[PDB]
Design a protein around this nucleic acid. Structure first.
Ligand code: EVP
Ligand code: EVP
Ligand code: MN
Ligand code: MN
Ligand code: NA
Lengths: 187, 480, 481, 188
DNA sequence: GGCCGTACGCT
DNA sequence: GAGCGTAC
DNA sequence: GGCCGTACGCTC
DNA sequence: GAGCGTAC
């Protein structure tokens, strides 16, 4: 479950979506209990691009995120109802971490589009040398402390281009995803 | 600040490629995925040979995880379990003791309750590994060394098959008969322009460990020619005549990768939903002595032959094997045909045997050089001893022996490291006998390296040796 | 066949009862360890997990211990290893752990997969001289491995780290003690075997908990040391800080041993809610790794803080008792022992360990000297030695010829044949002679220890003083009187 | 949790109370699905001698056994309502296995006394050694301890009721001192 | 120490 | 009163 | 990879 | 379809 911060001011508050419970336990100890909140994600999260609304809304992890942000989804989404002004994706420096990150960005683009537009979604930058093995106090000093941390602001430059990208990479149609891998790596 | 489109494209590609080249797809050379290779190399490094007693699974997994596989224990353990299952692997790679699960889909008992070691056929996958036959690479942390590929003295990719779900692609290679496969490699080595129809004279089709039946050579031919095709797997079922005009269906063999308990559950679902009629009783009489036995009792008025044909179409009693022969060729995925798979395997064998011969020649030339020094010493042993005795230090002794007896550093060092027992009658004769046999050995290795046909024949002879020792009868009957 | 229900109940229960007593819940008096602890520490030693080497994943340490010595569940091995790495559980921690090993709030350690471990520097002293025939080795559960029945234990671990085990028909509860005080007690006992428990109390003041705190009186300690049973009152370290004008605050810096800090705070919160205690405005846990244990209790102005604190000792686990029940396995059997008995059995184990080590070292020294005597003969008659070897057809004839011609033993003859040609150089001849002379003086020293009981006892004393000066530390628990 | 057999004839039917789920999974695969039923017991079972009726009746493990046998307990016990004529205690060949066995016999003596009198309670004899029940393969577990033609079951017989009553009270009761004395006297 | 969520592709 | 620590 | 049953004895 | 097999 979500380990929330003491402050109720969303402007100064921030949420960290951590990969796993062990990392989650380390993040909840190293964090600033006043401004930082932690939401642990149990492994791979549901791909909303391949799923229908009934599955998405019934999904435990998807539900937990909506409740944590308290904004709602789709047409009922309200930016003023946001509980955090900074939604930080904190995954392992491995290939699976990058996958969980894509799955989260797929959910945020299709259900919380104005959240990315407002520049509320960020990506944590841990060094490539995973979160499950990351040291307690060092995890705060490298990717959490506002002074020397390096967060990547997720910006939407082209909406038409992005729409086709998520459809190709995360969509049901395998054939176009195969051609993308072939073109950008195999050949 | 990072662009969402650029972030999605880069992150997904990093994962997609890692699942392709380092997870879900097997290598064309040894037929293994990284997890399988790391288990088998682990078992070898741990000295878990077939002659030695079983070791607890948690300990085997721990070592594999700690030095080669930085992933979850269950991923390593479950991959090891399948390798010990005689119904999953046509030629099992792991010899397990305890509960390793059955055909009814019930899993293996947890690591702590099971013990394992490698099978005799696995020694053939790791044969000549420490003879500079394969390239070694740095592990995940760089504190250990791991093989990029195993020598694989038998065509494992086609022998045990592969079934892996990657990103943008997947693989589904059926298991084959070793005797048939080796004969195919031998036919390819004699004729490099061999047709896939001519290779099919040796390799009739897939050979499943669960036996069963294959409907037509047509699907097999397509799979072997294109790398893709559908093969119809049918259960071995007999309709026996009984007293009072009654009949019954007896299933003795089931299709590959089919859950026996789930198949029985499906027949029971059709009887309750009244989707099939003429069935009075459904029993699972499977025992260790008779093997697989599924008894279906037929009603007097109902035609058993009709019910059986309906069971093939409605239940997994007849399942299809969707062939999609994708293996990593030069670290890249490729849809390969039967010939392509055997070509890449034979080319790997040529490299493994050539590299072994090159390694063995280096060690033979080095040993002969040492023996030449010991032979000089044994001819002038009074002079050798006097030279050593007059020397204050080992450095002066080395200097004096090299200058007086025209020896090298390696030669002079070997003489100083020579034990007094080497001076006995038999021990002198042993040094001379070893040297003579070694000269003839150097000659034999030089003959292999000079002529490609001599090398190819050695590859052929070694493959025939595997075929005569590990080769077995065909299990799956291919019907026309 | 048919079995009687009464006979089946009596036989089966006795088998379990005895196994829990002699091979589970009770520690040995000699090394102060239960079988699980001994198997973990021997495992860490066999795995080469010394303090100088990098940490190894807990699942791998447990796997080896389980597979070789402990045929029980992974959690039983892991949790026992965890306690040994906890600085609040063990006065002298036996395991050096990396990661989450739990805290005083009763929250457990992170799963075996997320933790790494190795032994502490003090653990090397428990395993010191183990491969020197000091202790008896026994067959493991399957008979495919060898395990120690007891560790040499060069420091009195039973009293140093205590014990708390629930057996069948009995239980044990030994408090931890200060090493400097304990070694001083052993040294006093070695000088006077008829020492009184009151005289041993001049060195060993009382129990010394890793969680520090306070002890109310010496009376309860005296009973525990004289009979093996007694109640010791443990009180928290609390100060009434004058926080301003008429305002006050109680600050708890130390808590009693084996007390859950979070559950203790939960009890104070229970009393405030139920109105069982008055004068408390706020209750906070300001405990951090840098500051240590810190429990802040805010008092109302014009309300007596000293009265509330005294009520908190009576009503909450802020003041808990330690029920001493000193039961350890003495000659493979449980026994309620006093302070003197515990030190007597420990000192007697040290005498045996040092005597056996000296006996082992002398055997190896006499064996090496015998070999060097053969090599010395060979180096004086080189030409003759070589001619004898050369004329021989086989190694068997060479052995027979060397033994007969140079009056050598079977072992001496083998050593000469295994001797390398480089041993014939100037320095190598002098090296053999120098080793032999030093070895004769070594044999003399070991023979002096074995001949006189006092020389042996002094070596035991000197080695114990060496442990005291290296691993000895200040007292943590203040004994108030 | 109970993996029941196909046959509904109690005279030919039998239940095996196995120690653990791993052993349970092995037993349910190696068994004769027609005459043999399996009930896995997750570790140590509640000691009914030290517990009051409200705890015994609310205990998950205790509840599952009563439902499996379908006889009832105490005064409402009916031998005619028995689902199995053979209740086999199948525990590991270790010291803890013997303890679970005592705990089960304590429940059977205090709540299902005529079940022992009728000779319905049996003790399985698995191969002795370091290897447990969950460590064994499914086929050898049937050949050695389950097959009626090769197995060796021990019939639990009640010779003296007054003697047994005092034994269960001493060994499994709340007063420790009498149990301590027994261990000290019979210690080997 | 058993229960059990998700990605990924094919048929 | 309930919870310590090795076991299943 | 978190949730969580039981035995066993002692003293609150 | 749903379930194969390595991943979190
Ligand atoms: C489910 O499969 C079986 C389970 C069991 C029990 C068990 C039983 C439980 C239950 C939990 C447990 C669990 O205990 C937990 O272990 C945890 C391990 O980490 C430590 C830190 O904390 C422990 C908990 O304090 C404890 O509650 C098992 C561990 O090993 C066992 O023997 C325990 O919650 C419900 O019923 C027996 C079997 O037959 C052999 C089984 O087949
Ligand atoms: C609970 O805390 C976390 C859980 C997870 C998931 C997970 C999630 C689950 C769930 C189960 C699992 C479980 O998967 C199970 O593994 C089992 C291992 O034995 C084999 C026999 O059978 C496997 C199950 O088929 C599989 O389903 C975890 C194992 O490793 C994981 O990554 C899995 O049931 C409900 O939701 C991820 C986390 O962060 C990374 C967490 O913090
Ligand atoms: Mn990771
Ligand atoms: Mn057991
Ligand atoms: Na079908």
């Amino acid at each position: 479950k979500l380990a929330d911060c003491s402050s109720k001011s969303p402007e100064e508050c921030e949420i960290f979506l951590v990969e796993g419970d062990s990392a989650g336990g380390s993040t909840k100890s190293g964090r600033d209990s006043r401004t930082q909140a932690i939401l642990p994600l149990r492994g791979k999260i549901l791909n909303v691009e391949k799923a229908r609304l009934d599955r998405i809304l019934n999904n435990n992890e998807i539900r937990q995120m909506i409740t944590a942000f308290g904004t709602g989804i789709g047409g009922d989404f309200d930016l003023a109802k946001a509980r955090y002004h900074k939604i930080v994706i904190m995954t392992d420096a491995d290939v699976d971490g990058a996958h969980i990150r894509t799955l989260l960005l797929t959910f945020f683009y299709r259900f919380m589009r104005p959240l990315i537009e407002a520049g509320y979604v960020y990506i944590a930058q841990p060094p490539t040398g995973g979160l499950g093995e990351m040291n307690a106090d060092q995890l705060w000093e490298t990717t959490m402390n506002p002074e020397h941390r390096a967060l990547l602001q997720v910006k939407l430059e082209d909406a038409i281009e992005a729409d086709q990208t998520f459809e190709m990479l995360m969509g049901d149609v395998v054939e176009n995803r195969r051609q993308f891998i072939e073109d950008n790596a195999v050949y | 600040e990072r662009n969402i489109t650029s972030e999605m494209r880069e992150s997904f590609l990093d994962y997609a490629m890692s699942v392709i080249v380092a997870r879900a797809l097997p290598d064309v050379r040894d037929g293994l995925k990284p997890v399988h290779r790391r288990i088998l190399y682990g078992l070898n490094e741990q000295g878990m040979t077939p002659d030695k007693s079983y070791k607890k699974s948690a300990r085997i997994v721990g070592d594999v995880m700690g030095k080669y596989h930085p992933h979850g224990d269950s991923s390593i353990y479950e991959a090891m379990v399948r390798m010990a299952q005689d119904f999953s692997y046509r030629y099992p790679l792991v010899d397990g003791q305890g509960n390793f699960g059955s055909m009814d889909g019930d899993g293996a008992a947890a690591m702590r309750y099971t013990e394992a070691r490698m099978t005799k056929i696995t020694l053939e996958l790791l044969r000549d590994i420490n003879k500079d036959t394969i390239d070694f690479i740095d592990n995940y942390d760089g504190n250990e060394r791991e093989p990029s590929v195993l020598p694989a003295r038998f065509p494992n990719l086609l022998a045990n098959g592969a079934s892996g779900i990657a990103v943008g692609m997947a693989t589904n290679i059926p298991p084959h008969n070793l005797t048939e496969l080796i004969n195919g490699v031998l036919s390819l080595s004699k004729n490099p322009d061999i047709s896939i129809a001519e290779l099919m004279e040796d390799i009739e089709g897939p050979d499943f460990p669960t036996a069963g039946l294959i409907l037509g050579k047509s699907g097999i031919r397509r799979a072997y020619e294109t790398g893709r095709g559908s093969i119809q797997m049918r259960s071995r079922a007999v309709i026996e005549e009984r007293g009072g005009g009654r009949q019954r269906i007896v299933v003795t063999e089931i299709p590959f990768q089919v859950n026996k308990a789930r198949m029985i559950e499906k027949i029971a679902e059709l009887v309750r939903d009244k989707k099939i009629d003429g069935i009075t009783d459904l029993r699972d009489e499977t025992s260790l002595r008779t093997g697989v036995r599924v008894v279906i009792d037929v009603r007097k008025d109902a035609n058993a032959s009709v019910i059986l044909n309906n069971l093939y179409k409605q239940t997994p009693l007849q399942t299809s094997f969707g062939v999609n022969m994708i293996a990593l060729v030069n670290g890249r995925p490729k849809l390969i045909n039967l010939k392509e798979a055997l070509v890449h395997y034979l080319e790997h064998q040529k490299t493994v045997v050539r590299r072994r011969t090159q390694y063995n020649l280096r060690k033979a030339k080095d040993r002969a050089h040492i023996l030449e020094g010991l032979r000089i010493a044994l001819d002038h042993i009074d002079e050798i001893i006097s030279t050593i005795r007059e020397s204050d230090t080992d450095k002066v002794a080395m200097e004096s022996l090299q200058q007086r007896f025209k020896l090298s550093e390696k030669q002079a060092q070997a003489i100083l490291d020579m034990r007094l027992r080497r001076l006995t009658g038999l021990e002198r004769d042993k040094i001379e006998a070893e040297y003579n046999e070694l000269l003839n050995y150097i000659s034999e290795l030089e003959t292999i390296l000079a002529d490609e046909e001599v090398l190819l024949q050695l590859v052929r002879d070694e493959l025939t040796e595997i075929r005569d020792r590990f080769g077995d009868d065909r299990r799956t009957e291919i019907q026309l």
